[PDB]
Structure formats: structure tokens, C-alpha cells
Amino acid sequence: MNRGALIKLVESRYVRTDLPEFRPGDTVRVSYKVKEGNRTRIQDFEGIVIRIRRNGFNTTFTVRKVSYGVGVERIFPLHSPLIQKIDIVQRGRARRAKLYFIRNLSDREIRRKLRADRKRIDQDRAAERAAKEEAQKA
Amino acid sequence: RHLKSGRKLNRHSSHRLALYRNQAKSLLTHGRITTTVPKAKELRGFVDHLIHLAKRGDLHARRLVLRDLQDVKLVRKLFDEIAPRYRDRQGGYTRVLKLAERRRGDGAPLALVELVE
């Protein structure tokens, strides 16, 4: 009963072991929702993210995405309401994590400051039909 | 709830740093060293850390050692005499122990660093 952390880690029937790995580079696609007097929806949300704050239990992620009005910032609790949430093209090579300088100048400098690592997509290429080779080897 | 954490003080953060480092230099030169108790404590911790780094032998580490210190011949004797002996030792290579009387003039609890081997 000593390690309080032990106990909290035994509360870990609450875990998400099936979510797209991402850095505070980019992310994108979808999330979850409610919407209307019965709930019934999962309002899709893309996004270019900002912050990964690690809490183990609920390492939350704040996300920037600029829509039909202006810039919008939505933070998600990594583990329940969001069903699949799954992104588009992660991106990275970010030096920090906290993309706050983007609430300064969000424009082409955004595009002018982000390159996804190809190596990631190469890993995706391998794991693509190595997953069928996985559905082939023992 | 201040202090509710740790770390002793009374200097400039810089002045602190430079003091710890110096004490390490003067130490590693000799081995058994007279100081005041609080000093002695945070001292033995800091220096111990440095010596466990010395227990390795990477250049990264080496510079890091002398990044916190000064003399080259000191890194020689460090990684040539000191570090080799305390090889099996996985802990406090320094032992600090209190002395009687107290620091004359204003009465302060004294202590002595030791080589411990």
C-alpha cells in the first residue's frame, strides 16, 4: 500500500493501448462527441496540435486547428471520450513541444517550419504489408 | 508550504555552484577535509555524484566533470588513481563526520570529508 503510484497503476483498467503515436509536430483527423438531446454524434476534428503533457493516467494533448472563423484550441483527455480519434500525417522535427509561437504567426511560416520525417512514412511503408507478412509469419 | 522539498542555501546560485565545485577541487586534491556541517552535507552529496560519474570513463563524462571543475591534471588523477580504486564501490565514496569544539569565533558545527577506502 506504500507506493501510491503502484495503486494508481492498478487503477489502470483505464488505459488506451491502441492510439496513433504522435509528437507535438502535427496530428489531424477526428475525435468524438455528444451534440443534441440524446447525444448521438462524434463531431470530427482535425488539428495541428500544440502540447503533450504527460500524466500517465491521462497524458492530455492540446490541439490547435484554424477553422472557418479563426484559430481554435481544443484539449483532449487521452483516454475515454475520444473513440478512435486517429490522425492523418503526424509530422515532426519539432524542437520543443509547446508550439506557442504559432499563436503569434500562424501562416505560411507554419508550412515554412514543418517537415515530417520521411523515415516515419518509410516505417509506415514497411509496417504496411509487413502486417500481412505478420498475417503470414509465426 | 515553503522548503517542503529540500536543498540548502545562503549564497548566490552562482556563488553556491562555485562553492560546491571548489570544495570538490580542494577535496579531490586531498581526501579528508574540514568544513561546516550543512556545507559538508550538500557537499558530500554533490561530490559523490561527480565521483560516480568518474566511475565510468566516457569523454562526454570526462569533460562534464571538468566542465564543473578546472585543472586537467586533476582529471588525470581522477580517472587514473581515484576512479580506479572506487571501482567496486557503488555509493558514497565520501564520508563526512562531525568534530568537537565548534568553529571558534561564532561557534559552528564542524565536519570532515573522508576518502573512504
Binding site: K35, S67, Y68, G69, E73 | -
Partner: protein, 122 residues
């Protein structure tokens, strides 16, 4: 946090484009409004050919703020500003041309009209 002595630009046709915060309809000690809130409003910067000239004093309901508020499931949301919607002494969105993403919080309050014409509700 929206309090008085704050500039709020509207997100519709209106006849205005910037309105300052006067008071709150909330309890006489609630000097604080946010999402789905009722704020009395002076008009400070408007556009000529229109209805609500500069100096007009009508009411308003916020759709968008620079301080995200936690949605009941621990997932917040912010719009980089202090945008509102103009309403009258009868709770009615005076204009007709709502602009940008609102907050569904408004939907639960009683501004069902906005929710509708609202493009991307969040």
C-alpha cells in the same frame, strides 16, 4: 474571462463590428461572463451603412473567448478572441449572418438559432 471594460467584436452582419462589455445579466455580484453568457453591450466600433450605429447600447451573447472553458468531460476549447453575437431586449440574435465556429455550450443555454446557422459548432 470576459468582464466589463473589454472590447468584443461581433460575428455577424449586425451593423456593427466592435462592441464593448457593459455589465452582466447574471446575479448582481457575478462580474463574470464566458460561453453562452448574457452581456450588456455598448457599441464602440461599427460600420456606417448599417443598423446599430456607433454608441448604441444593446445586449449580447458570447460565442468565442480567449479563455477556454472545460467541457463536462474534461476537454476544453478556445477561440482566439472575445467574439460575441448581438441580441436584443427579448433574447434574439438581431442579425442573420453568423460567423465562424461557435460553442455548443450556447446550444444548451437558449440560443438555438445561432447553433443552427453556426458553421462548425465546437
Amino acid at each position: 474571462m470576459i468582464q466589463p471594460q473589454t472590447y468584443l467584436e461581433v460575428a455577424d452582419n449586425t451593423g456593427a463590428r466592435k462592441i464593448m462589455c457593459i455589465r452582466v445579466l447574471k446575479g448582481s455580484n457575478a462580474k463574470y461572463a464566458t460561453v453562452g453568457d448574457v452581456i450588456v453591450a455598448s457599441v464602440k466600433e461599427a460600420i456606417p451603412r448599417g443598423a446599430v450605429k456607433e454608441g448604441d447600447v444593446v445586449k449580447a451573447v458570447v460565442v468565442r473567448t480567449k479563455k477556454e472553458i472545460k467541457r463536462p468531460d474534461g476537454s476544453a476549447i478556445r477561440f482566439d478572441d472575445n467574439a460575441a453575437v448581438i441580441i436584443n431586449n427579448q433574447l434574439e440574435p438581431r442579425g442573420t449572418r453568423v460567423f465562424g465556429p461557435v460553442a455548443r455550450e450556447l446550444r444548451e443555454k437558449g440560443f438555438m438559432k445561432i447553433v443552427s446557422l453556426a458553421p462548425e459548432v465546437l
